[PDB]
Amino acid sequence: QQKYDDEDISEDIKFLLEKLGESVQDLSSFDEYSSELKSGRLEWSPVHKSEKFWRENAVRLNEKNYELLKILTKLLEVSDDPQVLAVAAHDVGEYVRHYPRGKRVIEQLGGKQLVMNHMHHEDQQVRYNALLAVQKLMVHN
Amino acid sequence: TEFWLISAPGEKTCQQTWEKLHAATTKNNNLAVSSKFNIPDLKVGTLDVLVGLSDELAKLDAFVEGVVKKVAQYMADVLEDSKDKVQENLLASGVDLVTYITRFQWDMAKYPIKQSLKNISEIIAKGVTQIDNDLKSRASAYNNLKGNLQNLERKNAGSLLTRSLAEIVKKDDFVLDSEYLVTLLVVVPKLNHNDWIKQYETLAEMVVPRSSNVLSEDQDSYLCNVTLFRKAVDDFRHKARENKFIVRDFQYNEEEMKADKEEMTRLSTDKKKQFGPLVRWLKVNFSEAFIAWIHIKALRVFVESVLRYGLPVNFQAMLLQPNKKSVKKLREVLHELYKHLDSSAASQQEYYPYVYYKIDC
């Protein structure tokens, strides 16, 4: 927003904006994403909130027998780390936001009870995210 | 005249006399004509489908009312001692309208009742549509011929400016086989006849001298001609148009008017020779149209009675003629005579505690 007479500043900021756009777009992917989600190391990557992943690439989480969703349920049951729990819960919520059929699948699995159990928790941030996830489940339910 | 058609549940077979006249349930103490209706034996067919069939039957009856009213208004448009109230006495299939309505009788040969009443209603609808289209075609053709006749009549209408000279002028007042002489009929009023007939050389030169000869006289102006050179017609018209001398370059030929007059007479004669058949067609067609009108009304009464009473089809239908301006008193009487049929619920409006239809002239 701050313009300057120096052509260097304007050209470099434009060029960096474009290149950073390419960088974030390339970073936005499913392969390394599913690799880390499998390994259980859930850092707060900005790809998780990337809307385009859930608009077009959402069905990739539906692996064989919903392997990704079930193993995230298992890892939520296993790990106690608030930040990985929050990351997994947010990913599950944003996935179920668009597929009301997978919502019935998840309800049949019973992960809603896991999220209800994690709702009351020492980390009120995890509680708040669990409320958001349960709410996305309360969509039409 | 306005007739009511009322049905009752028929819990009692003595109700036939009640329909006839019976004093204990009469109208205005035998001051209004009551009459039994023809109650034949017609099957039921359906009940759950029959509700939609009845609704569509009512729609078809509305269409029937529209088409028969169009038949009536064209009958009044017939004309020739058969305009509106002229022949206000129309005939229900050769008998009086009142006669047929009061002597209603039903016949199965029109429509075998062993078929579905839905099929019967559809066939009546088909016949009604066919006669509607026949009426449209006949009316269009006859109206076109009427317009042609009226146009030919108006061809004999208008002044010399706006009308030809078929029966005024002869061939020999015009120059015959001329080299360059164009005879123009310049109509001149009596207000300027002398001016035209004596100042003709001053009107234009290159004209035949002493050609100022009168042809005939009409009711407002006089008729005359000028014989002159073809180019000089332009100058003559140019000077003459401002002295009350109307220009009319009338062309004459035997065919040009004889054929038109003969065709006018022939068209009039043929229009009459189709007018006769038109009366016969309208009579015979409206006969069956009005018969089927009462028939579909009766079918509506029957189906409504069957739906609104019970399993047996034992209802008591009747035609009635409420006394003039005592319809209110009879409304009281019939409300008292029809509330007890149900006695549990039955505002009446069209939802009476009984089944009612109407038919009028």
Next chain:
Amino acid sequence: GFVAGVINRERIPTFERMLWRVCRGNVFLRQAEIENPLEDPVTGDYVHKSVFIIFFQGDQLKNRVKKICEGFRASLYPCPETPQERKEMASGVNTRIDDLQMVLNQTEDHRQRVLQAAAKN
């Protein structure tokens, strides 16, 4: 199958009168009443409820009466049927209503406890 409409009384006699005349009311009268109501979904009126149903089994009637009743006032979304397993499943949903009201209470507590933090400054 038989369907019972949902209406807060109001104009049962006049509306059912018009239904009797239009449709020829013929079937058994199912009566029920709810006191201690809840506020109406779309306006919030805390109004008792009472129902007097006669529901026909023909399709044309099922559509025409449905049109008229939804036009005036009703909730014909439910459709009770012969099997009782659907009723047991719906009672399972009813027991789940407990969880749902708990989640709603949690949401209300959260939205009421977040505001004072911003209000303090």
Next chain:
Amino acid sequence: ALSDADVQKQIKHMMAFIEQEANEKAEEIDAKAEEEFNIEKGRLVQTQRLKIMEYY
């Protein structure tokens, strides 16, 4: 506009016309049975006639 028994009378109305509908459906089903018998018997007779004619 029905009493405490007339409602049952109209239930009986629907019931007994359903009985008549069942009777009519049964009669039409016998008509279909006759027609199906006709066509299937004719077809089977045709096939068996063809086999005997070729053999003969």
